[PDB]
Amino acid sequence: MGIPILKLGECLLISIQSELDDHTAVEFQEDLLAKIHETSARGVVIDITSIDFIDSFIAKILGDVVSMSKLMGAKVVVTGIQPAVAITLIELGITFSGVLSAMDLESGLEKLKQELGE
């Protein structure tokens, strides 16, 4: 009801608009893995460009859906992270390695198809 999935030749996509609570994300966290069961995948591409502030528990969720989607087989790309979300709030207790971040959704595909699926 606001979070679409528009899979594109074994490569999924994710748009994320402005969220306000972690009760949205728990209904969302099951929806991504329920899609990656229904179709085969090689890399999901999470796009968080439209977010300027992040709850610290939501950063635990968005830091988790990386590792929820690594075990299924697919890679992840957390593309288009803004400054103000990244600079002083992702200095928290993350372990972001092997994440393959990108700059924008057009170049975010070709940093994934250059690695996997081709």
Binding site: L33, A34, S40, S67, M68, L71, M72, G73
Partner: protein, 123 residues
């Protein structure tokens, strides 16, 4: 009377399809079955030691102890160098209070399983 409990442990097969090794588990991942890994390891050095496929696609779900099931993935580096882990479930990976190789399915697992043994399946 209790011949059901015997031949309940020894239903973790280790068929050798193309000689990496294969395996499959059903839904019984309780802590009493430590033979889910110690009966795949005693045979692992017996036959050829190249990559294992566990293929636990029907196992819903492990309870709270994956440190008998995901410590061995860092322990079949011993006597086998290797290990994968094929097709987890959503509520199964919902258990993450806290690397190794994983794959969506077996027919994509068996592709890169033959990459480590350096062989192709073509024509």
């Amino acid at each position: 009377e209790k011949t059901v409990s015997i031949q309940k442990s020894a239903l973790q097969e280790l068929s050798a399809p193309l000689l990496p090794i294969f395996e499959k588990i059903s839904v019984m991942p309780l802590i009493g079955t430590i033979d889910t890994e110690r009966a795949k390891l005693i045979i692992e050095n017996l036959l050829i030691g190249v990559v294992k496929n566990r293929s636990e696609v029907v196992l819903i779900d492990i309870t709270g102890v994956p440190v008998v099931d995901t410590m061995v993935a860092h322990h079949i580096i011993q006597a086998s160098e290797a290990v994968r882990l094929v097709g987890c479930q959503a509520m199964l990976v919902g258990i993450r209070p806290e690397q190794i190789i994983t794959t969506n399915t077996m027919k994509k697992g068996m592709e890169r399983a033959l990459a480590l043994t350096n062989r192709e399946i073509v024509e």
